[PDB]
From Swiss-Prot, chains A, B:
It comes from the Eukaryota. This is Magainin-2. The lineage of its organism: Eukaryota, Metazoa, Chordata, Craniata, Vertebrata. It comes from Xenopus laevis (African clawed frog).
Amino acid sequence: GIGKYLHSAKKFGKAWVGEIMNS
Amino acid sequence: GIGKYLHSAKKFGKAWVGEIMNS
């Protein structure tokens, strides 16, 4: 268990927001 | 190009943070 929120979420966590949070 | 930050990140954005942001 736990193998995306720490290696796939965090990454986008800082990029996805700049995407949605910005657009 | 685009497809995981606005179709997968947000999801974890709320779960991954409650994961790492929680501890």
